[PDB]
């Protein structure tokens, strides 16, 4: 099936201004999207805001502002933040959007009509801040901001008791089918240890899920249950549905939603190929969402990838401050290189300088300038290579192999491993150049310099191609410099070694340009 490659971020609670971590979550989505476009696929990257609910209403109340004006305000800050971050996101969805509301009601009725919703009670614990139901096994003693109280073991936020007559979803009726799913498709959750988590959790057992709430308790800031106005639809069913809505909106060039199609198939987007989420919101995506879709008879997503950060809680680092100080591409690169799947990373100013200088400036930067220098490349062109020594071939072989391995990494997706894979190959090219001493060759042996300079150029191109989803602005400056024609800057075709042919002319130089400039160690 050729289809639109559909990738998502989570949609974020608008309770507080956007910080790092939304930025991280959405950057991953952006990168995954960007890569598939570099492959020449159709993409649809979605992101947005989660605007309804108790959490969000009570933040609006605590600021003495109306929910309508509050959400709109904060949503605008999220849009400004993401514009400023220079993502290539295809659409920004809001759950207040009337077309979304329409899809939630539509979905609820599917779920209702299958007989997977019934009127019951939920008498148990709830984290308003997580908008999560919790069994007593996942609460414990702690402090309110300072009295003694019970808190979520998930997040350490304050939980409270809840005894409401609610509409209930038959999640228990879906235990075995989730379990078949998980096993049948072992790629479906990334990273592997969270897949194991999700299975152990569901093995142990699933109770039914309370998919409505008394309207009094939600401050009437939510979507009403179809055919029962005394209730509102659980904020997470509302939130998760953003993906299905997203998959059905027609969007103009300006980024404005213009139409909601009846059948998701019409746009060939649903289901999501990859859902980017933080580890704090796994259950909702890996248990609830599949159960809802299986009820509605909808297709399940292909991949849920849950990165190592929290999606929401501010537990100092301002992206825009750091982006101005170090660079937008540098910051994105640093965040992506440093953060693994279980997050044990160093985000100190010292480390950011070490990597910017070490990797981007010394390994990539230097190398780009060597092969384009007037000193070495005296014709500002791609020379035609002579015969290859077994060293020459050793590196060519690395450069040939890099797209295959970088691709697989991107498809996991483990963007960090992908970056390493490339930079390994960059460090090889430096090593190569150190040996050959191209500076010495331009006098000694011009015939050899051709072979050397050609391989350098083509490695630096192919590495920069595979780096392009991470360093989107700089890859354009690298290609401009190497004089790579615009057609050769994307497509699986141009992952092949030698796509840009000899006798191509390098880009014009500038009197004081440097690609990445070192920052003092202080």
- What is the three-class DSSP state of 76? helix
The number of beta carbons lying within 10 Å of the beta carbon of residue 289 is 25
Specify the residue for token string 């998502």.
8
Residues between 189 and 248 that touch ligand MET (CB under 6 A): 239-240, 242
Q: How far is the CB of 40 from ligand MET (least distance, A)?
A: 29
3-state secondary structure 172-226: HHHHHHHHHHHHHCCCCEECHHHHHHHHHHHHHCCCCEECEEECHHHCCCCCEEC
Q: Does 48 bind ligand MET (CB under 6 A)?
A: no
The one among 5, 6, 13, 270 contacting ligand MET by CB under 6 A: 13
Task: Number of residues interacting with ligand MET: please give it, by CB under 6 A.
Answer: 11
Q: Please identify, using beta-carbon distances, which residue of 19 and 37 lies nearer to ligand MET.
A: 19
* 103 lines the binding site for ligand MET (CB under 6 A): no
Q: Is 92 exposed, middle or buried (0-12, 13-18, 19+ CB in 10 A)?
A: buried
Three-class SS of residue 500? coil
Residue 132 forms beta bridges with which residues? Answer: 127
Does 50 engage in binding with ligand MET (CB under 6 A)? yes
Dig out the tokens for 432 from the structure: 């190569």
Work out how close the CB of 89 gets to ligand MET at its nearest, in angstroms, rounded to a whole number: 15
Choice from 10, 319, 365, 469 touching ligand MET (CB under 6 A): 10
Q: According to the binding rule CB under 6 A, does residue 44 interact with ligand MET? A: no
Q: How far is the CB of 52 from ligand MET (least distance, A)?
A: 10
Single out the segment in contact with ligand MET by CB under 6 A; choices: 6-14, 174-182, 248-256, 374-382.
6-14
Which residue, 51 or 392, has its beta carbon nearer to ligand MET? 51
Q: Other C-beta atoms within 10 Å of 188: how many? A: 19
Interface pick for ligand MET out of 132, 210, 311, 494 (rule CB under 6 A): 311
Q: How far is the CB of 102 from ligand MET (least distance, A)?
A: 17
**Residue 312 binds to ligand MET (criterion: CB under 6 A):** yes
Q: Which of 281, 460, 467, 506 binds ligand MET (CB under 6 A)?
A: 281
Among 5, 6, 12, 309, binds ligand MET (CB under 6 A): 12
Q: What is the DSSP code string of 243-266?
A: HHHHTTEEE-TTS-EEEE-SSGGG
Q: Which residue in 423, 358, 432 sits closest to 393, CA to CA?
A: 432
Long-range Cβ contacts of 430-434 (<8 Å, 24+ apart): 430/363, 430/366, 430/367, 432/391, 432/395, 432/456, 433/367, 433/370
Binding site for ligand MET (CB under 6 A): 10-13, 50, 239-240, 242, 281, 311-312
């Amino acid at each position: 099936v050729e289809k639109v490659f559909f990738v998502t971020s989570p949609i974020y609670y608008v309770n507080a201004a956007p910080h790092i971590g939304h930025v991280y979550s959405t950057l991953i989505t952006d990168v995954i999207g960007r890569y598939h476009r570099v492959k020449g696929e159709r993409v649809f990257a979605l992101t947005g805001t989660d605007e309804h609910g108790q959490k969000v209403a009570e933040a609006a109340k605590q600021k003495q502002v109306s929910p309508y004006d509050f959400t709109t305000a904060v949503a605008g800050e999220f849009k400004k933040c993401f514009e400023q971050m220079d993502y290539s996101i295809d659409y920004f969805i809001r759950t207040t959007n009337e077309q979304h509301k329409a899809v939630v009601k539509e979905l609820w009725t599917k779920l209702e009509q299958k007989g997977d919703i019934y009127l019951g009670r939920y008498e148990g614990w709830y984290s308003i801040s997580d908008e999560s139901f919790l069994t007593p096994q996942n609460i414990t003693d702690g402090v309110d901001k300072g009295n003694p109280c019970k808190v979520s073991l998930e997040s350490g936020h304050v939980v409270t008791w809840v005894s409401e007559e609610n509409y209930m979803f038959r999640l228990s009726a879906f235990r075995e089918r989730l379990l078949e799913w998980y096993h049948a498709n072992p790629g479906c959750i990334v990273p592997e240890f969270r897949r194991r988590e999700v299975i152990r959790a569901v093995e142990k057992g699933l109770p039914d899920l309370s998919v409505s709430r008394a309207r009094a308790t939600l401050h009437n800031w939510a979507i009403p249950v179809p055919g029962n106005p005394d209730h509102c639809v659980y904020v997470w069913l509302d939130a998760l549905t953003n993906y299905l809505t997203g998959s059905r909106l027609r969007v103009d060039e300006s980024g404005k939603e213009v139409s909601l199609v009846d059948d998701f198939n019409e746009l060939e987007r649903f289901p999501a190929d990859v859902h980017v989420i933080g580890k704090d919101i796994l259950k909702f995506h890996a248990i609830y969402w599949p159960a809802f879709l299986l009820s509605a008879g909808l297709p399940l997503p292909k991949k849920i990838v849950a990165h190592g950060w929290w999606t929401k809680d501010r537990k100092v680092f301002d992206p825009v401050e750091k982006a101005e100080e170090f660079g937008y591409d540098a910051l994105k690169y640093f965040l992506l290189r440093e953060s693994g799947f279980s997050d044990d990373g160093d985000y100190s100013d010292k480390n950011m300088i070490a990597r910017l200088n070490g990797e981007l400036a010394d390994t990539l930067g230097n190398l780009v300038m060597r092969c384009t220098s007037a000193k070495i490349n005296v014709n500002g062109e791609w020379p035609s290579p002579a015969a290859y020594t077994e060293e020459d071939e050793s590196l060519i072989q690395l450069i040939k192999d890099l797209p295959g391995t970088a691709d697989h990494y991107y498809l996991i997706p483990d963007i960090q491993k992908a970056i390493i894979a490339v930079f390994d190959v960059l460090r090889a090219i430096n090593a190569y150049v150190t040996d050959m001493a191209p500076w010495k060759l331009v006098k000694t042996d011009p015939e050899r310099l051709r072979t050397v300079l050609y391989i350098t150029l083509e490695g630096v191109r192919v590495t920069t191609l595979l780096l392009s989803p991470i360093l989107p602005r700089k890859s354009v400056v690298i290609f401009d410099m190497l004089g790579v024609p615009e057609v050769h800057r994307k497509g699986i075709e141009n992952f092949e070694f030698g796509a840009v042919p000899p006798g191509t002319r390098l880009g014009p130089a500038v009197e004081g340009e440097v690609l990445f400039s070192k920052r003092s160690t202080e």
